[PDB]
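Ligand-bound model needed. zinc ion.
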Amino acid sequence: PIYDINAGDNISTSIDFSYEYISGIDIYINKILIVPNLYTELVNINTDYSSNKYFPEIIVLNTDTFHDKVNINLDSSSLDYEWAIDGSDFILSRYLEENNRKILQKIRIKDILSNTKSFNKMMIDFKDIKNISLDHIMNNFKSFNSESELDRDHFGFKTIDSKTYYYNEVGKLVKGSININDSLFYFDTIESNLVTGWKTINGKTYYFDINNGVAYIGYKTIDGKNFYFDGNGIMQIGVFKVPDGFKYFAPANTYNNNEEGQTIVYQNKFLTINGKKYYFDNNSK
Amino acid sequence: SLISKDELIKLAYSIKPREDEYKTILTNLDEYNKLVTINNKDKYLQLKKLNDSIDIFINKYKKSSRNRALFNLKKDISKEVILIKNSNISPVEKNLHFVWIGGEVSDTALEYINQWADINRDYNIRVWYDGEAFLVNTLKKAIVEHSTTDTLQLFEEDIKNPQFDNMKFYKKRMEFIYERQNRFINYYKSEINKPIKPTIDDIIKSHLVSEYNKNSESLELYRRTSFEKISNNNGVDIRNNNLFTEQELLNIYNQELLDRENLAAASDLVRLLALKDFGGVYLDVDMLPGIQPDLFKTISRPSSIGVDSWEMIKLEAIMKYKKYIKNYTSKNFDKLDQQLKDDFQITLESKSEKSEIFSKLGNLDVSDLEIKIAFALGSVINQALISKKGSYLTNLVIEQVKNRYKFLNQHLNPAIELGGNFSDTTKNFHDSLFNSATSENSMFLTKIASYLQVGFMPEARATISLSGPGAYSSAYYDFINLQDNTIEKTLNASDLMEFKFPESNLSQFTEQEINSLWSFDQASAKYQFEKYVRDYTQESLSEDSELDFNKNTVLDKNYLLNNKIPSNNVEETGSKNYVHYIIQLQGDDISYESACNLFSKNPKNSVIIQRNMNESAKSYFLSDNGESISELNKYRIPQRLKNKEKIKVTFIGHGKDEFNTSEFAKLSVDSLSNEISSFLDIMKLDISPKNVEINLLGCNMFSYNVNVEETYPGKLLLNNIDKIISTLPNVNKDNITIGANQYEVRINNEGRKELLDHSGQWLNKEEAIMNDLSSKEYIFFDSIENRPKAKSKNLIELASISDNIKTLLLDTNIDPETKFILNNLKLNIESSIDNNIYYEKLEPVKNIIHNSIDNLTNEFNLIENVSDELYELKKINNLDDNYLISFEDISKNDSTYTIRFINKNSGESVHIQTEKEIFLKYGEHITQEINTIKNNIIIDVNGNLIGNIELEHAPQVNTLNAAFFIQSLIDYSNNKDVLNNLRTSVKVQLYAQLFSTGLNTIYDSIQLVNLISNAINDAINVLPTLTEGVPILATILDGISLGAAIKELSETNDPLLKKELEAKVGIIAINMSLSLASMISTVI
Ligand SMILES: [Zn+2]
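Prediction:
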């Protein structure tokens, strides 16, 4: 909350957060850390999802204040929520399915179970029900289990049972292509598991090695077809130099239904590529 | 003391005029600040009045700007109370109280009492007794005996069925007891109302001889001998000494003594009133004086014995070698090694005087506001109490007792008045009770619901909340937080540590005390009912009287694979990161079936070992394709499980039928420890886990949560922790847990739970399943306090059990007896949840974000500590608010520290000496922080910093912590920051070390004044950004930021600034100006 020390009888008792002001940069954020002060009486959390694409876990910290009850005001339906405990923290989780997108949002109230005062002080307001205590939630809502190896703290590659994950120096999974040890890996954008094979990103094609997960660069052989990938691993089309001469890496279906970017047999014909001419002898060099 | 009036006037500033309540607060604060009296009660009442006024104002103007200051004032008032308490301490009166009501005092109690009398001869011993109630306990025993016999007779056909749920027995017995209690109450009401009043003993004697066929002459003889005994042993009569001056307390005492025969609650009231009227020290009849601190200082405690057993052993050795007390056992002492025994005897026999072994009390200093109470398991207990005559806290405790008893009676009496039987009274009481539940007394109401059953049915615990430690904790909260009549609020342990009875004077771990400590749980209930039935039919019964412990049925792989695995409906949720050994120990049919089912619950991670076939034991596990049962050598596992992080091992057997069983599968503790060692030395070849969780499964294996070190799992953990940690290097002591279960539970195809019973077939006993599930405890070794502790319960499982119970109560096919049983079980589970939250048993998560936030709070503690100390120091040496403390100039002289204060007006420096080390410890700390901000700064130019940029996560985190810590100090606006100034001392030190060579080398007062003015007027920013303040543009050359300097140089029109930037940095602009072009053209 914004603290204007001598503002007069207008000190704000509210913290208003929205999942829509971090749109765009929500892939660069670890966790959202709400910190009330003495005056905070209401915590407005506008849920939503038509704007964002990944929603970070919210943590609501418990401070001393002279208010008897602190409201957490959620604007969503109470029908989708489940609760769990972890040590002294109380976890609420919301799950929805819209447009083949799974929406999973987590709110952790920190150390609310430490004693009777903290336990009784927090109240929750859903859209169709108001003033729901934590004890009432424990008694009337469904419950889930909050523990998994993907929630631990690591700092390098992890191999959880079929699939590899990578954790930053702060212990968060990595999503999207990124460079580690001078190599371009690509971790899937939802499951965060290491991706292998052919990958077309925004109309440019890459190949990620099945052995290590590193993207190929240079002149490579794939299942008896020879491809060429530039300095960044983007597959190239054109006339390029390889250890055996100059060869044609041709567009789709130029000769005998050749795939896009494979070498082809080009005998005794001129070639024109965006204004440059070449000529290929009998041996397609 | 508190801050004075005008400093508050400055702190609590707001634009609006002073409201009336703010005037009242100022008036009360000034009135307090001048109150010169030695009677602490008046100081305390003035604090109370001030606090009430502050609360009124804060509640009326929740949005005001002054509340910040006022709120801190409240905080300070709380601390102030302690300062009042810890002054004017004086020795307690020379009195020693004990209490024994309702029967003849036993000889063992008298020996424990004489031990106190002999070494403390300057203290007046008093044994309080009730001269008109010597036959009450006999009445209670007669009621219980007759009701027990009637109930055993009524169930005589069923009681030989091993399927008997003894809760039916107990409910029937309680109905009979309630009938008889109402009978006696009506008789007493008719008798006492006569013109001539007979005493209680005469009425009890008449009723006993009339109804239960007692011999009147025997009762008279018993009364006479009891009276003469207690009279010859310092007896003091309650009724002769005029204790109950209020009618309400006398009504409570009568309700507890006569209507319920609850001698414990009567003793609670009497102990409080005796302390209130006479003052002194109250002690239980089984507390012994503290042993001298240095007597056994030379003998080292073995690693295999916990601390409590060590104290018990010391007392046993003393009482064996000196023989002060008759029949003091030596059971624990004899198991020691011979060397320790000889050291004990040597150290003892040199000591002649009893005063060389036990410590005198002497003069105990306590204030006239405080009462001190003993501590056990980290929580208060009323075993031993210290109080002056007429203490304040004693009257607080008595008001708490009276309030809780009034809320109970208000609901109980109308329910009794209808004259119904036990069940109808129960139902009406419960409804009238739970109709009034709010957010403040939910836990209290849940706890006192079982008031009618205290002492007759298992797990009734209203006494703890009515007059037990609940009243004391509530009184302490009301005291420190200056309120009245709080229910179920608590102080933090740091504040409870203030009121601790001095431990050096009390030896709580006596032998009578451990026997008093065992509770009327489910274990004792089962094993006492068995005793009743054996003694009523003169028979022999055993659950597994006729089972074969030799059948040795070999594992049928197809029975496991085609029947057990596919029929299982119980999938465990959570982390699958463990490997589960199943070690079957005994060869009967039930052990085999339980092992097979337990394997079927998780076939992929479990291995079976049939140990009973000693030499031929092999490890059977599901093959990697999931279609076949492969086998390996004993205790060996396939490769696919060697990467797991945690081990879970389950021993299966039958436990010997005795309370606190000592043999499991016919193996004592040491035999099973050898078994564990043999298992470990082979197992360590394949896996190095981080956790070990051992189970003991079988009949008669219970989980006790009191007297842990006395039970089988406690001994097992203490004996095997060293082996387990020595063999597996990665395992911490806090990662080894031991549990015990009784029943094996499965889920059928219908969705209901069934348990494999000792007769070979699975019945569906829902009450027993729920109870055994909810009662399980995991024991681990607390390394901080160095003793076994029960781990906090799983709240999710308890909530699931409660939900299942509610659904069962909706099903109307359940008969009313089971409805009553299920309702009691629901109440007990809710009480267990509330106990897990109320006693603060839930342990924090401990990961990175939680470490960060906790370090932030730990830093915020130090600042307030230092602020209070600075207020004190500056106030004593009469240094005003114009002096800034320099944390660089603290010098140590062998007991003291000299600190240099700087005047912000003249620059003159003063030197003050103090004894507090804190000022040094903190002073260097900040000194290091400004030594990291200054370690990534590169030479400044135009009175402005041009810093360095680092993009590694090793040095970026420390710099961010240093900047957050110093920024918090420079923006900290505490109360008590006006007589001292910490926002300015730190700011001036920062400015001096950033733009100069530091305050420590600057002594010229003119330089000091100019630098102080510069620092105070200039605002500095330290937390990492790229363009200090606003957004402009980032041009980071090799590890150097140059956005601000570049934007300054492209508009400066100042030759001095251009020269500085060229000389110290190297920047060179082009100067594309038309005027200069023209000038040079004319020059050429
Ligand atoms: Zn058995």
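Residues 77 and 205 of chain A are 42 Å apart (CA to CA).
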